[PDB]
Protein: asparagine oxygenase
Amino acid sequence: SRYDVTLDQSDAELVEEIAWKLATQATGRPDDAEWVEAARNAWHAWPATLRRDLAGFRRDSGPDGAIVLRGLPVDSMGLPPTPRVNGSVQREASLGAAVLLMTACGLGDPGAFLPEKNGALVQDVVPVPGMEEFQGNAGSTLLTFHNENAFHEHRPDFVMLLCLRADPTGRAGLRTACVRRVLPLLSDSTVDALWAPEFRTAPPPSFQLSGPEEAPAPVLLGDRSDPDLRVDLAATEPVTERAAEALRELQAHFDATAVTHRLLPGELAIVDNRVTVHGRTEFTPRYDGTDRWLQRTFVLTDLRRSRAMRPADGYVLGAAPQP
Ligand SMILES: [Cl-]
Ligand SMILES: [Cl-]
Ligand SMILES: [Fe+2]
Structure:
């Protein structure tokens, strides 16, 4: 399978060397344009085999709309305890930030949203005490299936998750479900419903004090046989009864066809957010610094499209127009 790639020893050693040099020698820090520029240049030093694998995935993300690469460099012996605060982000140069931002520049460009993790390009995904029931990074309850930032016009094209520390408890796993697997299984009425403009996905309160009551829109987008989708099973509200039934059937088939991944250190999951939803199983964190630790970076395949939301042609998307 070209969607599960283990680095051979030589390639893993070359990537480690490149990542260390970037992390230690590049001027500035990960969120600075000059550091992203260094990562972009560093990406082109990677082994050609890996660049070819990623280019292949970008061109065709396959029936599960996801790839896992294994054997990437993480400083396990140097890793501090897993962070325990909401909004934990990687502001300082590190091996993890190097790996993520280099890969981001290979697939497109990294990006982030000002109202989410303060627009940090490399974001920690860790369980936070008191946030157990929360539908987000910090929770440890069941995270229902969603496209990342489904409400947003310039939502991530890819979501990348690098594992620094595995969940020691064995109950946590990333779940990904692709529309390619479910579409041929869906009943005709459900398919019709999903193409109809009968679903409202409002932005979360963090993204606006508020205004424009979101116009109803379809869940399925683009080609009839190979559509994209835009859904959040927590946030998307059906406007009609048939839309409600359709979401229930959609969820059922996501659950039935989802791939569940327990990531290990040095493993990088890349999800095609145009065709694949993700979620996470419930688990019981230890909250003792040994818990699951992933770092996340979003990729925009055509950064240019979001320029109106990126002051100074930066990597942080805000808002506006207005009139
Ligand atoms: Cl490209
Ligand atoms: Cl996992
Ligand atoms: Fe998510």
User: Anything to note?
Assistant: The helical segments are 9-25, 33-43, 48-59, 95-107, 179-182, 188-195, 241-257. Residues 1-323 form a domain with the Double-stranded beta-helix fold (CATH 3.60.130.10).
